[PDB]
Each structure stands twice: as C-alpha cells, then as structure tokens.
Amino acid sequence: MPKHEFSVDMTCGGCAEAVSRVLNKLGGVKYDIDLPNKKVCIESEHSMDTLLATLKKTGKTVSYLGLE
C-alpha cells in the first residue's frame, strides 16, 4: 500500500531492464520506472529498507525521494 519513490541513476534502457529484473525477483511490488528522470516508484508492503537494498543490488547509485 505504501507508495515509495527512489532516485536510481539509470543511463540507458539496459539499466532500466536490470532495475526491472531485481524488482521482479523480489516480488510483492508494483513499480514504475522513469528512465529519463532517473526515478523509480514502488508500491509495496516491503519495508523501505528492503526496497533500498534491492535497488542497490543493481550496482547503481540509489537514493530515497520519499513517500508519495
């Protein structure tokens, strides 16, 4: 239910696909990826901690833009 927003420095479509893959693997998420604006929105019951950790697995620089 909570709606989180993250900054992920994706710089190509492949970067976006990889973010998609780690989120798909985690599961229990509803996400939206805005490549041009380096933003990823995630609606999930998973803690912000878990979402942050999952996104960091990509090797990309990740920051929190907060709750919607």
Ligand X SMILES: OC[C@H]1O[C@@](CO)(O[C@H]2O[C@H](CO)[C@@H](O)[C@H](O)[C@H]2O)[C@@H](O)[C@@H]1O
Q: Amino acid letter at 41? A: C
CA dihedral for 43, 46, 48, 52, sign (positive or negative) = negative
Cα–Cα distance for residue pair 54/22, rounded to 1 Å: 7
The site map against a second copy for 20-49 (x = CB under 8 A) is xxx--x------------------------
When binding is defined by CB under 8 A, the residue of 13, 27, 45, 49 that contacts a second copy is: 13
59 binds, among ligand X, a second copy, none (CB under 5 to 8 A by kind): a second copy
Please report, as ranges, the residues that interact with a second copy according to CB under 8 A.
Answer: 9-15, 17-22, 25, 57-60
